[PDB]
Design a protein around this ligand. Structure first.
Ligand code: CLA
Ligand code: CLA
Ligand code: CLA
Ligand code: CLA
Ligand code: CLA
Ligand code: CLA
Ligand code: CLA
Ligand SMILES: CCCCCCCCCCCCCCCCCC(=O)OC[C@H](CO[C@@H]1O[C@H](CO)[C@H](O)[C@H](O)[C@H]1O)OC(=O)CCCCCCCCCCCCCCCCC
Ligand SMILES: CCCCCCCCCCCCCCCC(=O)OC[C@H](COP(=O)(O)OC[C@@H](O)CO)OC(=O)CCCCCCCCCCCCCCC
Ligand SMILES: CC1=C(/C=C/C(C)=C/C=C/C(C)=C/C=C/C=C(C)/C=C/C=C(C)/C=C/C2=C(C)CCCC2(C)C)C(C)(C)CCC1
Ligand SMILES: CC1=C(C/C=C(\C)CCC[C@H](C)CCC[C@H](C)CCCC(C)C)C(=O)c2ccccc2C1=O
Ligand code: SF4
Lengths: 165, 733, 144, 80, 64, 150, 40
């Protein structure tokens, strides 16, 4: 398929890998009773193992000669062949959360700079203010862009201290 | 006061042992000597370069002499596949009889060392066939060494010392070095290949005794002067040619086959002849570019002054840079080390994948040593390139004469440069380490299918563009309908495509997720090492914590415990910290090269593909697995030929650990300890009769950092050298 | 105020002795002598280690380097409120007096002192290292 | 011998003189500051380079600077 | 009559100062013709823990 | 010093005391190789550290796989500590200045001024990580070994 | 009670609660959606 890979659902090594893991679990099972606590736990593990291998094959991943899933990172190859969920979609999932956390913290830091004693508002958090800013961060991409266009996102070069040069 | 050192009265007046250590360590810093002038500085450097050249040719002479005297070159040339080369003989009176027998091998008279430098394959390829060939070369280079040494003496004499302006004639030196040093030398080397090397590869002897009566080509210079240059590319060596013999050989002296000689698995000699002829023409032409006494050519100052973007994006542009470069030796040395350091890496990269010497590929130990050798030397040279760039800013940089040009503007946004290098290093470290740890946890819990394996699609896409059809991209040279494929299909593609699609050679090895992780670790090493070195240079002239750092020099201990503490604040210390990261980076590179090749050389590439995605595989399947033979070199039952590498392996660990002492424990502890030793000696009867002349003191703050770094580096190098050679040689050799 | 003259016969504190005292340097290069007046017998700490009792009246001690003498001076002045002075003594018998150089401790401003190593500029107004290059020796921009 | 320089930003606090453990510095009359006194370094041959004076200077940047130079028995702080 | 008013905010222009390009509050201005009459206080301490420093008339400018 | 004490105890017990009793006699875990091998540094490297670390490095996929992870993680913490021991805060305070500039540029600079650790805290942080990494490395190596064979 | 709630607002206490909450959410998600590798 892509880069010589093959779908895991059609991979011989991938299928053999599942048997090896289940065989290991089964070997430990036969030293217990039918419905003892250890036996129930082992059976639960085997169910998750079978579900995991079905899900990855159902997801249409690609397996190498090693018979293990490999991920596609190029946006063009991902959208071309329906691998957007491996890296491409999670890329924009993380950035939204990462910007959320960073934007909320920046809003709080600006908020307390106006207070009389900003330092005491950092070791001792103003929880009522933090919760207020936590909820308003859901729209950070909109607020972040509007700050950039209005020119209030960055400090002026003349207001930033620098070393002699 | 003491005589030594003669070049510094400050040191000579010091009554302590620091005088001895510092005298050695400042010998070659000519700029800091007493009474030094600019003109005398250049003449000393010119003389020193003659000394370095003489050592290089004497070192080469010693290698030629010992192989001929004690090696088995004449036996090796007969059957290079199944004979281990001999470096030199061993005369160690400490050896026991089992050791003498153990190191006797290769049909030698007595104990000998096996060569790993590849000089056998190199010398055999260039036409050497007998011990007398090596003897004449050894005497010739010993003579050349003497001549350079004499020239070093000659140009120090009253009537032969060049003036200051002579050393600053940039246009004339570039014209000569490009056309003569590069161009003519490459043209001459083409002559050797056409007249000597190629005939010797076809079973015909050509020496000084008969080379004037032997025709390199059946049509002698008629094609050359008539423009019918294609006649020299007809009837090349066939695929059945046996190197060194006339069976299967051809007649062409200039070709573009583009592949590997099927038997020797190395580049064709007729391609290496045409290669050197081609660049020689380019270099000779390129050497007619600059102004001289003949009224034509460019003046480099004019070129720099012109290139200022009209929009003011680069400020003043390159105005004032000619004097900045032409007047500073540290600027010139930084550019020389940066350029040479990169080319040393390029040599390592291209020599392992395009082996130019016959039977070099099959000598696995030689290939491993050659790649590791040059990558570690490249790493040191790169650190030096930045060190002397930092020294330039402190010593030679003049803000007034560089007002508003590119160099000055680099200091203007140094925080932006350092901040972004910091971000890239953090990003690569977090995600590179994180993915490795994730894969390790998955392996520990027995779920190898849950790990994050990212296919190197971008690098696999490049290999497709070069003709590797495994990945099925069918791109450019991988597609038989592209214009790129068609145009080259008659010159070099048939040979190139045949080699790149052979998976038993190192030409564009197949890559997978294991290679993805390691490459991103290499990027982390390059960026972090650059961050440390770049910060050391841009902050060399000063910082908020020390606004006037330039007034103290490149290397000073500290500014004291005030202002919070200033340990390791000089630009010298930034270089010192960067050497650790350079060793770490080159270590990752050489581990990656070695492990990927051991699995290839054993045919079980699957081990690397499976075990390289988590860090337990490296520790288990590479370091632990391949140490079994090394540490058995000597054991309670006996010893074998690997006992020297087993001994050197522990020798490295000891020097490395000793370096920790100079890096962890600092001066104040040791100076107070030495004071009780001074008391003890003076009060001891029968020993206080003897006394010292230099008052004992502890090493300095700066000295111990260098001494600790030297032990750290030496132990680093000797440990891996012993393991690299022992693991590779024992496995196959 | 006139330069005091050292009296080698001055009594010394009651001290058993230690291994932290003078070495062969005192016999070849120099040593230092500190003297002071004591109001009453008291125990003080020797910079070389241990405790000594100062006799009432004049006291004299010999030390291996200047910093040791001025370390004891700080103790006597700050804690016991005395006023010591010490010298530099050479093996040839010459005696050099210092601290207080002019009789008044340096912390207190005194007329008649001449400023030394004073630059009438800021640290940020020094020249660049390139402008003091090839001056015959390693010279900082601050020196010129 | 080390090099010790006093710059014209001195405010005459006397803290450098008190801090010095070898009586290298002293205060002298001056007219360039409110205190009408300035630090002086008349005895730099006894300086050891501890930089306690720089630790004690309030001005920013420092008004007293120590440049470590040639070593000797006195500057190396040896008692042997 | 010389220098900025007491309590006003000024921007520091001494490149070697910890507070270069930063705003501080003027405490007093000496009228005795000393080299550095202006005294400025800052809310953030420097590396030595100090929060006040003396500046010349031309080394300080009014906020903006 | 204590690392050698616990290596001495571990090798001596396995070699000369611990073992399985059978009809012929006592077979020890390491088969009495202490006497002939522990007189060279190479013997300790090969027979003790290299041979007995087989259990810990093969622990993945089993109930002892946790010791394998901590064996690597301990190696990491130990090497991480050398950063604090081999460096000084002068470099790090200047590095933070450039990092602070980026935050100032984005109006996200903290009110509590970032500072590189003090000189003493660098030494305290270094030795604490050095000890934790070194001791935890032996801890994983001992338990994965003795539990597996003992 | 005002001072006690002020103590709970100190940085170490907030971080412990916040990471205890954050860790719990991630642990619970993986309890009901075991082995997530691809968004799907
Ligand atoms: C990080 C850099 C990088 C690299 C090395 C690649 C590499 C590749 N991309 Mg990807 N791509 C990237 C980033 C990158 N991409 C980004 C950031 C985006 C936007 C989110 C895309 C969007 C994208 C699309 C839409 C497509 C590719 C495709 C490709 C492949 C061929 C064309 C190409 O991009 O040539 C080298 C790459 C560059 C010079 C960088 C810019 C690439 C642009 C954005 C896309 C070019 C597409 C091209 C015009 C398609 C023509 C048809 C093709 C079959 C020949 C190649 C494997 C094509 C593919 O699937 O081929 C099989 C394709 O259709 N890429
Ligand atoms: C007690 C231990 C010991 C000692 C003393 C020696 C001694 C020697 N060995 Mg042996 N060896 C040993 C153990 C030892 N070995 C062990 C355990 C093994 C493993 C089996 C070997 C394996 C071995 C091999 C394989 C070889 C030797 C060789 C040698 C000889 C090197 C001669 C030489 O070049 O000298 C001069 C020494 C040097 C050039 C190296 C030192 C370089 C200096 C220190 C660098 C710094 C220079 C700097 C400017 C300072 C200058 C100071 C000034 C006063 C000169 C020498 C007789 C070699 C030999 O036979 O050579 C003919 C050789 O090939 N040994
Ligand atoms: C044609 C005239 C000519 C020639 C041949 C040279 C030659 C040389 N000059 Mg120059 N010089 C000239 C004119 C010339 N000069 C003029 C006119 C001036 C006055 C303006 C100067 C002023 C001058 C100075 C001031 C200095 C030199 C120096 C040198 C030496 C540089 C070091 C060296 O050996 O590099 C050899 C370099 C190469 C052979 C090429 C290296 C780069 C290639 C690409 C590397 C890879 C090649 C190949 C793959 C390697 C194979 C390796 C093998 C093991 C297989 C060299 C011998 C320096 C020196 O050492 O003086 C003693 C020096 O200080 N020259
Ligand atoms: C610098 C290298 C070099 C040297 C010294 C020689 C020398 C020689 N070659 Mg060889 N040769 C070389 C390179 C060299 N060759 C290369 C690169 C090729 C491949 C194209 C060949 C291909 C070749 C063939 C096919 C033949 C020779 C022959 C000869 C011999 C007779 C030449 C003659 O009489 O020309 C007379 C020519 C002239 C009077 C005019 C020469 C004009 C050219 C352009 C040179 C200009 C000067 C040049 C730039 C100087 C370079 C530097 C200098 C120090 C050498 C002679 C021993 C012939 C022979 O019989 O060999 C035994 C012969 O048949 N050569
Ligand atoms: C051709 C390149 C070149 C040249 C001409 C120079 C020249 C110079 N360098 Mg530079 N440098 C270079 C390469 C070069 N460098 C490289 C590659 C690096 C990176 C490693 C550096 C890093 C560097 C630093 C950090 C400094 C210099 C400095 C200097 C100056 C003083 C050197 C001195 O006194 O050494 C005296 C030599 C010694 C004290 C001993 C050197 C040997 C070391 C310690 C390793 C020894 C290992 C040993 C042999 C192993 C034994 C093994 C055992 C088993 C036997 C001088 C102008 C110094 C200076 O003053 O700059 C302004 C300075 O601070 N250089
Ligand atoms: C294994 C040893 C080691 C490690 C892991 C690091 C890591 C780092 N070094 Mg250091 N360094 C080392 C050895 C090491 N160094 C040595 C021996 C020296 C010689 C003195 C130096 C000298 C040095 C310099 C001079 C510089 C660095 C820099 C860096 C950073 C590079 C960027 C990076 O990877 O960011 C990613 C970060 C990491 C990989 C660090 C580890 C992160 C861990 C895994 C987080 C775990 C968190 C988790 C919740 C558990 C917490 C538990 C706890 C609360 C109990 C990073 C913090 C550069 C820097 O600071 O750039 C900004 C830099 O300038 N290092
Ligand atoms: C670079 C770091 C890195 C990355 C990218 C990942 C990524 C992943 N790890 Mg791994 N891991 C890492 C480091 C990393 N790990 C480290 C350092 C360790 C050692 C402690 C582990 C130990 C580990 C384990 C033990 C497991 C993973 C698992 C996972 C998966 C978790 C998916 C999930 O929880 O979805 C949950 C879905 C979400 C949407 C979470 C975000 C929730 C917010 C509210 C969404 C908001 C949207 C707007 C994912 C593939 C799990 C797995 O199955 O992997 C295949 C798993 O079992 N990791
Ligand atoms: C079991 C003991 C639990 C802890 C009791 C703490 C009592 C105390 O100090 O109260 C101190 C304060 C209340 O008591 C306060 O004492 C002060 C003493 O100077 C003043 O008298 C205040 O007026 C009074 O309100 O406690 C609280 O406000 C509640 C604390 C949290 C209780 C719930 C969590 C622990 C259970
Ligand atoms: C849809 C069509 C969109 C076309 C956009 C054209 C933009 C041209 C660049 C203006 C950019 C511009 O404003 O240049 C301004 C500046 C050049 O400075 P100068 O002072 O020399 O010139 C100022 C000029 O504006 C007028 O002389 O360059 C840059 O800042 C970046 C240059 C990038 C150079 C890129 C080289 C080519 C790389 C390959 C790119 C792909 C090929 C095609 C594009 C060239
Ligand atoms: C600090 C300093 C310094 C230093 C510096 C350095 C040390 C640097 C380095 C640098 C470097 C080290 C760089 C490098 C670069 C590189 C590059 C830039 C490359 C490029 C390439 C290319 C472009 C290619 C292309 C291609 C391809 C890819 C393929 C095909 C072919 C071709 C050719 C097309 C100095 C002295 C100046 C002084 C001042 C300061
Ligand atoms: C790396 C290093 C530093 C830099 C290290 C620093 C500044 C410590 C960093 C500690 C943490 C990571 C920063 C503070 C984190 C906050 C508590 C906020 C965390 C919020 C959540 C993510 C938990 C030194 O300061 C140093 C000093 C002396 C000798 C060696 C070194 C040294 O090696
Ligand atoms: S140098 Fe500093 S400490 Fe000394 S008097 Fe001047 S301001 Fe005060």
């Amino acid at each position: 398929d892509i880069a010589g890979l093959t779908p895991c659902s059609e991979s011989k090594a991938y299928a053999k890998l599942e048997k090896k893991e289940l065989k290991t679990l089964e070997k430990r099972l036969k030293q217990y009773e039918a419905d003892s606590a250890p036996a129930v736990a082992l059976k639960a593990t085997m169910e998750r193992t079978k579900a995991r291998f079905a899900n990855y094959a159902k997801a249409g991943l690609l397996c190498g000669n090693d018979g293990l899933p490999h991920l596609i990172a190029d946006p063009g190859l991902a959208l071309k062949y329906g691998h957007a969920g491996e890296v491409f979609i999670p890329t924009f999932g993380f950035l939204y959360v990462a910007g959320y956390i960073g934007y909320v913290g920046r809003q709080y830091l600006i908020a307390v700079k106006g207070e009389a004693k900003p330092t005491d508002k950092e070791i001792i958090i103003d929880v009522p203010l933090a919760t207020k800013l936590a909820w308003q961060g859901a729209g950070w991409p909109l607020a972040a862009v509007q700050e950039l266009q209005r020119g209030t996102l960055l400090e002026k070069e003349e207001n930033i201290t620098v070393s002699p040069r | 006061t003491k005589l030594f050192p003669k070049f510094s009265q400050g040191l000579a007046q010091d009554p302590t042992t620091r005088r001895i250590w510092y005298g050695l360590a400042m010998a070659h810093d000519f700029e800091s000597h007493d009474g030094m002038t600019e003109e005398n500085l250049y003449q000393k450097i010119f003389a020193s370069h003659f000394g370095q050249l003489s050592i290089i040719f004497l070192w080469t002479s010693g290698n030629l002499f010992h192989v001929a005297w004690q090696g088995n070159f004449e036996q090796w040339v007969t059957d290079p596949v199944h004979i281990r080369p001999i470096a030199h003989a061993i005369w160690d009176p400490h050896f026991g009889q089992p050791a003498v027998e153990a190191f006797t091998r290769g049909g030698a008279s007595g104990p000998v060392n096996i060569s790993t430098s590849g000089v056998y394959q190199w010398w055999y390829t260039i036409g050497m066939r007998t011990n007398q060939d090596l003897y004449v070369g050894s005497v010739f280079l010993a003579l050349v060494s003497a001549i350079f040494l004499f020239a070093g003496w000659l140009h120090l004499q009253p009537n032969f010392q060049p003036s200051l302006s002579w050393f600053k004639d940039a246009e004339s030196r570039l014209n000569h070095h490009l056309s003569g040093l590069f161009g003519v030398s490459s043209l001459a080397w083409t002559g050797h290949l056409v007249h000597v090397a190629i005939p010797e590869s076809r079973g015909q002897h050509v020496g000084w005794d008969n080379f004037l009566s032997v025709l390199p080509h059946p049509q002698g210079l008629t094609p050359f002067f008539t423009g019918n240059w294609a006649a020299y590319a007809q009837s090349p060596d066939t695929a059945s040619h046996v190197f060194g013999t006339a069976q299967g050989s051809g007649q062409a002296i200039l070709t573009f086959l583009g592949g590997f000689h099927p038997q020797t698995q190395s580049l064709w000699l007729t391609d290496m002849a045409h290669h050197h002829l081609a660049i020689a023409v380019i270099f000779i032409v390129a050497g007619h570019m600059y102004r001289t006494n003949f009224g034509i050519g460019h003046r480099m100052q004019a070129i720099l002054e012109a290139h200022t973007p009209p929009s003011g994006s680069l400020g003043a542009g390159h105005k004032g840079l000619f004097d900045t470069v032409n007047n500073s030796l540290h600027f010139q040395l930084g550019l020389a080390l940066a350029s040479v350091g990169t080319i040393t890496s390029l040599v390592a990269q291209h020599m392992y994948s395009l082996p130019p010497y016959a039977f070099q590929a099959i000598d696995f130990t030689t290939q491993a040593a050659l790649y590791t050798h040059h990558q570690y030397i490249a790493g040191f040279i790169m650190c030096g390139a930045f060190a002397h760039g930092a020294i330039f800013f402190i010593r030679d940089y003049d803000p007034e004469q560089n007002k508003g040009n590119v160099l000055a503007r680099m200091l203007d946004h140094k925080e932006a440069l350092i901040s972004h290098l910091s971000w890239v290093s953090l990003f690569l470290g977090f995600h590179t380490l994180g993915l490795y740890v994730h894969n390790d946890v998955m392996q520990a819990f027995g779920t190898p299918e849950k790990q994050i394996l990212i296919e190197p699609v971008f690098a696999q896409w490049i290999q497709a563009a070069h003709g590797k059809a495994l990945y099925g991209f069918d791109f450019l040279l991988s597609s038989k309908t592209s214009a790129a494929f068609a145009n080259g299909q008659s010159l070099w593609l048939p040979g190139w495509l045949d080699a790149i699609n052979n998976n038993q050679n190192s030409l564009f090895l197949t890559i997978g997720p294991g290679d993805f992780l390691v490459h991103h670790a290499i990027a982390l090493g390059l960026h972090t090492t650059t961050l440390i070195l770049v910060k050391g240079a841009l902050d060399a002239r000063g910082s908020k914590l020390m606004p006037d750092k330039k007034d103290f020099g490149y290397s000073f201990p500290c500014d004291g415990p005030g202002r919070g503490g200033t340990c390791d604040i000089s630009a010298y210390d930034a270089f010192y910290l960067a050497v650790f990261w350079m060793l770490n980076t080159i270590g990752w590179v050489t581990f990656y090269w070695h492990w990927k090749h051991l699995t290839l050389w054993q045919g079980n590439v699957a081990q690397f593909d499976e075990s390289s995605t988590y860090l337990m595989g490296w520790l288990r399947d590479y370091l632990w697995l391949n140490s079994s033979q090394l540490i058995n070199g000597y054991n309670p039952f006996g010893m074998n030929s690997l006992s020297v590498w087993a001994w050197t392996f522990l020798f490295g660990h000891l020097i490395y650990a000793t370096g920790f002492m100079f890096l962890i424990s600092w001066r104040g502890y040791w100076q107070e300890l030495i004071e009780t030793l001074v008391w003890a000696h003076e009060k001891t009867p029968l020993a206080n009769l003897v006394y010292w002349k230099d008052k004992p003191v502890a090493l300095s703050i700066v000295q111990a950092r260098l001494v600790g770094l030297a032990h750290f580096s030496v132990g680093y190098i000797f440990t891996y050298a012993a393991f690299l050679i022992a693991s590779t040689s024992g496995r196959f050799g | 105020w006139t330069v005091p003259t050292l009296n080698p016969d001055t009594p010394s504190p009651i001290f058993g002795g230690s291994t932290g005292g003078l070495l062969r340097k005192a016999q070849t290069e120099e040593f230092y002598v500190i003297t002071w007046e004591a109001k009453k017998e008291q125990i003080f700490e020797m910079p070389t280690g241990g405790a000594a009792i100062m006799r009432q009246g004049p006291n004299l001690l010999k030390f291996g380097k200047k910093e040791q003498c001025l370390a004891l001076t700080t103790q006597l002045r700050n804690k016991f409120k005395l006023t010591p002075c010490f010298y530099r003594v050479f093996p040839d018998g010459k005696v050099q007096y210092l601290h207080p150089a002019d009789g008044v401790y340096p912390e207190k401003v005194n007329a008649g002192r001449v400023g030394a190593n004073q630059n009438m500029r800021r640290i940020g107004q020094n020249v660049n290292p390139i402008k003091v290059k090839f001056s015959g020796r390693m010279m900082s921009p601050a020196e010129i | 011998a080390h090099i010790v320089k006093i710059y014209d930003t001195c405010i005459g606090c006397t803290q450098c003189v008190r801090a010095c453990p070898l009586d290298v510095l002293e205060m002298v009359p001056w007219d360039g500051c409110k205190a009408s006194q300035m630090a002086s370094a008349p005895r730099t041959e006894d300086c050891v380079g501890c930089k306690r004076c720089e630790t004690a200077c309030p001005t920013d940047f420092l008004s007293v600077r120590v440049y470590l130079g040639s070593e000797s028995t006195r500057s190396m702080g040896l008692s042997y | 009559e010389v220098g900025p008013k007491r309590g006003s905010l000024v921007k520091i222009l001494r490149p070697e100062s910890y507070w270069f390009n930063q705003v501080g509050k003027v405490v007093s201005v000496d009228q005795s013709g000393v080299r550095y009459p202006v005294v400025v206080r800052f809310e953030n301490q420097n590396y030595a823990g100090v929060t006040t420093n003396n500046y010349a008339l031309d080394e300080v400018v009014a906020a903006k | 010093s204590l690392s050698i004490v616990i290596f001495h105890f571990s090798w001596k017990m396995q070699s000369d005391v611990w073992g399985t009793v059978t009809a012929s006699g006592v077979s020890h875990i390491t088969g009495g190789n202490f006497a002939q091998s522990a007189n060279t540094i190479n013997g300790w490297l090969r027979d003790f550290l290299w041979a007995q670390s087989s259990q810990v490095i093969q622990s993945y996929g089993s109930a002892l796989s946790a010791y394998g992870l901590i064996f690597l993680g301990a190696h990491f913490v130990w090497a991480f500590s050398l950063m604090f021991l081999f460096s000084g805060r002068g470099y790090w305070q200047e590095l933070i200045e450039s990092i602070v500039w980026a935050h100032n540029k984005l109006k996200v600079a903290p009110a509590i001024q970032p500072r590189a650790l003090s000189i003493t805290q660098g030494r305290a942080v270094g030795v604490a990580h050095y000890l934790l990494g070194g001791i935890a490395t032996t801890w994983s190596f001992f338990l994965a070994r003795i539990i597996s064979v003992g | 009670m005002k001072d006690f709630t002020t103590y709970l607002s100190t940085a170490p206490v907030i971080a412990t609660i916040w990471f205890t909450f954050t860790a719990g959410l991630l642990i619970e998600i993986n309890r009901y959606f075991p082995d997530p590798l691809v968004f799907s």
